[PDB]
Design a protein around this ligand. Sequence first.
Ligand SMILES: CC(=O)N[C@@H]1[C@@H](O[C@@H]2OC(C(=O)O)=C[C@H](O)[C@H]2O)[C@@H](O)[C@@H](CO)O[C@H]1O
Ligand SMILES: [Ca+2]
Length: 474
Amino acid sequence: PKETTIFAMHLGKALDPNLPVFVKAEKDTNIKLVNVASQNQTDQIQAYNLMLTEGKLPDIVSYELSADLENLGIEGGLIPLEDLINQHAPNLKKFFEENPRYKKDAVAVDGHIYMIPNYYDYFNIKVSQGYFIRQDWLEKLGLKEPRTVDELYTTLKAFREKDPNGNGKKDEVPFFVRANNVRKVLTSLVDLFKASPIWYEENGMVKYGPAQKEFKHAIKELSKWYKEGLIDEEIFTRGLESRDYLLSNNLGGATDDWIASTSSYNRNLADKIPGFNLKLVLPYELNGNAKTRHARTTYLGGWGISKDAKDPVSLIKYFDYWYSVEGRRLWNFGIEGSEYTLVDGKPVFTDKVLKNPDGKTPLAVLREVGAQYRLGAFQDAQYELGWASESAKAGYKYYMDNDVVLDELPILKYTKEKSKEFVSIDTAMRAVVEEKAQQWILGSGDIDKEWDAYIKRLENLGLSKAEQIQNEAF
Ligand SMILES: CC(=O)N[C@@H]1[C@@H](O[C@@H]2OC(C(=O)O)=C[C@H](O)[C@H]2O)[C@@H](O)[C@@H](CO)O[C@H]1O
Ligand SMILES: [Ca+2]
């Protein structure tokens, strides 16, 4: 039994090594994880920053912000992994050989690998979020499916004012989102208005979304919709249970969220809310613009081995376990005999996952056992297709066939000084954006009055230099 410290959080939860997935991994690898993040910590960014001041680094450092993680490597906090992989990680060695695009995500500008990313199965499923609306509420109110942002506005107003759930109460929450930080709230609100809360590419150039007039318009509109009760008054505080709560209580009318899990509610709530039909629609058009910037990335976050780890060989073997057939299946599907059984050598989920008696989504059930826990593993789309509804599967194709999805800007990588400065600027600007966007949407500040000063503040923090760094790396 090898006791191994780790910093690991995901979706606001510190990794619990007693979860079934990690107990099995412990048996198979003899690695016993001990988290340095405690169970009452839910802010991964603040926890990571605090962790950096605590002295000795944990053996394994997992983090969702890969640019920060790579900077830690460049500074010597994380060790290079490439020799460790070549000598002791045959599964990872093979994975990088077979997948050059994925290998590119793991290699820093200086040629070292400081982290193993958590890869999506991008070349099998590359869409992410889509727009959903309560078709049964449309039918009840005699309304057509809205196809433009103005029509959405009018439709949401009808949801708010005309009691579509039929209970005589003004309790409807027309548009809602699902998030565990301010960035994710903004992400699922501003795409409506063809804005972006992050960096994006435009004709060969890299631009900062929150500095654009499209973002100003998005926030100004959202402020109006907020005041009129068309978007959830609790958007910034409701947290990751928002969708579960608002749909299961027949309050929510529309959202922007991941296609498979959001599609699971029709079956999930069919008995509880007769006629419930939360239906995928193409992104609403804004003056003819039919595009969404919601796309799956090749990876999200990653983990590395710190300079303070006593036994890195043992740890790279732990990293490698997740790329074995059995280890990858474990990460993706949970435990054989519990979450799935093998049928002709292929995992098929059980009723526990597919027909959960407490209305948990299939993905929610899988996360509860430690499956899909973001570390540095490789997702398998067969897991997603294994619980996705027929409507979800048709939905992927709907979005792809209609060419509405714009690829995400890959995370750019820089040389050491530029990387340190970019992350510093990017982080400082993020704080300003998230402060002002809340103030403006909630009505405590006036965006028309304050926008120019906000832009000057971003510039003061280094927006132009960040723009230059981004475009050199592009
Ligand atoms: C890597 C990871 O855990 N990503 C999180 C998202 O998970 C995706 O969610 C869905 C879905 O249909 O809901 C399908 C994908 O298979 C799965 O990877 C998602 O939970 C998101 C919510 O904000 O958070 C990501 O970190
Ligand atoms: Ca009502």
